[PDB]
Write a protein that binds this DNA or RNA. Structure first.
Lengths: 77, 151
RNA sequence: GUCAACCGAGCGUUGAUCCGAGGAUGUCCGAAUGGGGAAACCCGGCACGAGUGAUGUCGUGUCACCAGGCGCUGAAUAUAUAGGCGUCUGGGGGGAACGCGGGGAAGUGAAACAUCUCAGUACCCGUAGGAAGAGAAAACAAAAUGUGAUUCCGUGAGUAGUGGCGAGCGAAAGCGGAGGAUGGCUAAACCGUAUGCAUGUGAUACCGGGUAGGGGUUGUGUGUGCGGGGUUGUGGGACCUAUCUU
RNA sequence: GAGCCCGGUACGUGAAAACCCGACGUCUGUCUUGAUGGUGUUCCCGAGUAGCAGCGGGCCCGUGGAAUCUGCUGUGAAUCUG
RNA sequence: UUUGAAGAAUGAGCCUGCGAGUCAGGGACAUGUCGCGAGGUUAACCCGGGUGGGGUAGCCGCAGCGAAAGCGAGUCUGAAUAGGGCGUAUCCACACAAGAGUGUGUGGUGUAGUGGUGUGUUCUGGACCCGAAGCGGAGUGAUCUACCCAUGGCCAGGGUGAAGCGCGGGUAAGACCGCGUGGAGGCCCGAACCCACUUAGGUUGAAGACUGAGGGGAUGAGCUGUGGGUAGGGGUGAAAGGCCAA
RNA sequence: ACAGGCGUAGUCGAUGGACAACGGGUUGAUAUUCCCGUACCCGUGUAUGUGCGUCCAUGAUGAAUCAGCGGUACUAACCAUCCAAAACCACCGUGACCGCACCUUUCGGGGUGUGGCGUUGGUGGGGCUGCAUGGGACCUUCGUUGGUAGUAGUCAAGCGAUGG
RNA sequence: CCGGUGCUGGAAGGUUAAGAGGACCCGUUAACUCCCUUUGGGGGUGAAGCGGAGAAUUUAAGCCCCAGUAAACGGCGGUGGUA
RNA sequence: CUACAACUUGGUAUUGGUGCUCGAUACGGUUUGUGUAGGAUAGGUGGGAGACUGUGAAGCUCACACGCCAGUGUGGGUGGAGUCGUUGUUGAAAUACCACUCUGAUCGUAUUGGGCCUCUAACCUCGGACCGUAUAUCCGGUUCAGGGACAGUGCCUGGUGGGU
RNA sequence: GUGUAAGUGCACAAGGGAGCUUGACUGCGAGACGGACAUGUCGAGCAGGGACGAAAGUCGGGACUAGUGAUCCGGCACCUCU
């Protein structure tokens, strides 16, 4: 995928099941979405690819904080 | 989402109240309008609620209030406080819109919005005296006469 | 130089041929990078210089892409932004193995076979380094008054065990050793700070008491960036508060 | 078929320049305005995390009574009688 | 190799050279030999120009029975010394009991394992050698052939005579009829060209799929050229399980 | 997931489009290529002259007003319409309701037509206040013209698109 | 020809996952009441809490079921006797 | 036979507001305790010597209704001092006041839920217009219009499934 | 005739009948058969505690041979094992 942006919750690769096994993965994706937000600092609307988890992070942490944390990682937002 | 209301709303209460509501309501409707505030801290939330309430009450305007502010925008010279280097004639840091509007607060009276201030047309960071204009109305806009504190 | 002779013409005691380290030159293709291209071949721009009666021509340089920093502008549109223009530094690809993270089979064995095994091997990817990774206890142990970062080797052990309890897989603790740095640096409470979004007790508060001018070291908030203080386990630390006070 | 012919060995010599080791003096900081201990209570000790549930990986361990380590979702706590 | 091959069962043209039970590992079992002997021996490692010295962590023996606790020359089961199972190197000498097959208590004789090495078999590894069809991963290939796209070119020559149009008859007006023009057609005969039906030959060929004489289509669902695209469980296919570099 | 898949600007790509040469001779070997002759298409200089317009200014336009005639027309307010605010009179099966004679187990409960305020209710017309409408103008004023102000400015050698 | 299989439609029912629930019990034990020799060992009740497997109940599609559909796959019979 | 893709169902995060309707949970006054002695459905139960009335009560017709239809409590209104005190019968006493409150049916209040009618602010728009842009059926951004807590995506789950 | 196929046996009855009744037990087992191996078959005799019988003595299923299925993995009751 375009890859998460605030955390880095990438995929994973499972395998087997019950009822006798069979070996066979099925990526365990993450739940990213395309929520947008508003930066009152620079007067702008930003769209991101963020999981619901990361939305939780935002609403109990801020957006400025998050973009600074992403600036660190230098994601091409 | 534990948040402190700023205005009155259906089935919540009135301004100043404290409510535990649904997360998305508070996420999408209230909080990104400056109509509420998170409840994280006692005095922090209290001060933010008080100040936001005063500012929301004081920010209003109508078309005729714009027609009157179009006349009252020719105020006296509203000066601006500065820390910079007068060595070469360049300013250390760009000066806010809050500073200009609080100068108007303590000189002329109107406590306007930082948003509509055409500070770009001011071109701060050249030491001198910058003119200014503001989106008061759709069509009507009036001008202010300004000066700077020499550094 | 040579396979590799032949011929011709020469140099060398004024130190040749030869050997070593550094420099210079370094056509064209190639990450290839001015644009283009069937790889090594076609066309140009800009500044300067050479050249013709002028054009053509020639020479020296430089012009790609992105990431970041700085600088100018801030389109719809108001704030202002994406973007645009200039400059500065990086990266770009190759490599024989060795490494770490991720993906990831099958023939085979099971006298068939799917679970299992072959193997997390081959191979593929992304990035490295001269080595890598791990690494300072939210660990082991068993009432012994014990050990004291990690890694790699020997043993424990083909054992305890696991397993269509079938084929087969398979430790660790502990013990002896190599090497020793039983290593260091931070965040938070708390202050001093620049600030930045807010407001206005507009005052008995900003500080060492007190003698006090002010009348706000903004009055009180709140995160930000800087500086101190603080780095622990038998708990420590910041407030507090006595004592000697190198 | 060579100890005494030749090349060379045992052995001792040798570097204007460049490169690598330390060695130094520069240069750079850094503690110095300090410490040892006392004493009774408030505050802090790394949060979308640890934990629990659902699918999965790998650990001697094939879901089994199955800890510890972990990946994705969902939910989601306290600071030392922790 | 076969019950049985001189065998009309296979293999070998001839010579010369090359070509198949191997190695690892303190692995396992059995057995020779050597050192030690109720003891035996070291591993990693350290020091050693060398093959040598050290290194006690470990392993094998020295007591077993029992699922286990646990007990101990006895122990387990069991209510039981009441029989049995396993064990107490073995033999030797005296006793008591029975001859249901011998046992039980004494005394002495006193227990032999381990580490190197050689041989044989054996376990894990390609495991005496050669031999598949075929499974999987990553890539190369549409210059042949299948289809499509873009753009050009080629189809001698001779016949038939549709629609329409005109004139005339006919009409009340038409429909209808004749003469002419026009010159359509997945039309006709036939070369180039594209195919390939029969037949003869060729069949260690002229040819790794052809030739001779005849044959089908031959203005169209055409043939062909230049450039290009689709790629492997996938393509493409006027579909035969055909074609995708003999 | 990463590798990489698509793809706009753009850039490459003829098998096509546009673009200027024909004949003869020559060597042992080349030839619309060299030679002979006659032609053509790009650009480039020097000079010759016919007309040239910038400067002179030669002609030829508009701005746009102070404003006058009549007329969109916040409009002070006027020509015609209904309905119902409170609502006017006439009457009609009335929630409680005041209430003639009687059905009715012999009676505490099941009713009827005329009768009365109320008119939870129903029909008809007239003084009626709110209403907006089309018509003509006044303020604003937009349409028609005298001075003016084609005066100061403006178009006029050319080349002229990377656009239509 | 609508029985069998399939397609479309419609849910009165029966079976029906996950999830939400968490009755009742079983582990552990703060605290008591007896047993005994004595240097507290062995028995019972055993609060809340933390845990274990957990029911009752509410649960959709589907399936069973009700009709239609064959230019939809498909299927189309015998003995006897009488002129 | 086992399994996977793809499709599909539901729960859940994204993902919310108001209204109505249908459930049970708890704070709350409430309907309601037929054993004979007998006014006799005797609410069991702990203080217990008057009993609430008059901040307007018997018997009462009627608004009401259950119904174990003998009977039950309730209210417009007269009534204006009435039943009653262990009334005595008893395991048990009033159904006197006060009350821990259970086998009950009703109903306010926090809820916990679902379904339905809707708003928009998340979200979607290969719908439009403008800009970056000179060129761009791309892409992004603003805005208009619309849809709309549905759909899409993630995680768990059931089903069909020779398509593999 | 012998519960059920056939054979070997049964009159000395193992056939027929009547009374008590649970040995259709527990802990073992000398020596033997048969034997690829695992399986399979009988077994006198000892001990507790019983039945029947007056006692001797017989009874560890049925006149005998068929009537059933290894191992692994789970389930129930009891144990003074962990």
């Amino acid at each position: 995928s375009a890859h998460c942006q605030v955390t880095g919750r990438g995929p994973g690769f499972g395998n087997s099941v019950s009822h006798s096994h069979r070996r066979t993965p099925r990526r365990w994706d993450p739940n990213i979405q395309n929520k947008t937000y508003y930066l009152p600092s620079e007067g702008r609307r930003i769209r991101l690819r963020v999981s619901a988890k990361g939305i939780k992070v935002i609403d109990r942490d801020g957006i400025e904080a998050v973009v600074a944390r992403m600036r660190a990682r230098g994601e091409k937002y | 989402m534990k948040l402190i209301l700023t205005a009155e709303v259906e089935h919540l209460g009135a301004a100043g109240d404290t409510v535990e509501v649904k997360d998305g309501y508070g996420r999408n409707y209230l909080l990104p309008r400056g109509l509420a505030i998170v409840a994280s801290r006692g005095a922090e939330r209290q001060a933010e609620e008080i100040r936001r309430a005063r500012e929301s009450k004081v920010i209003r305007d109508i078309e005729h209030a714009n027609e009157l502010k179009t006349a009252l925008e020719g105020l006296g010279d509203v000066t601006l406080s500065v820390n910079a280097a007068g060595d070469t004639g360049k300013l250390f840091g760009s000066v806010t819109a809050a500073d200009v509007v609080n100068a108007i607060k303590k000189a002329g009276g109107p406590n306007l919005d930082k948003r509509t201030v055409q500070l770009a047309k001011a071109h701060i960071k050249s030491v001198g005296t910058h003119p200014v204009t503001v989106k008061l109305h759709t069509g009507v806009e009036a001008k202010v006469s300004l000066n700077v504190v020499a550094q």
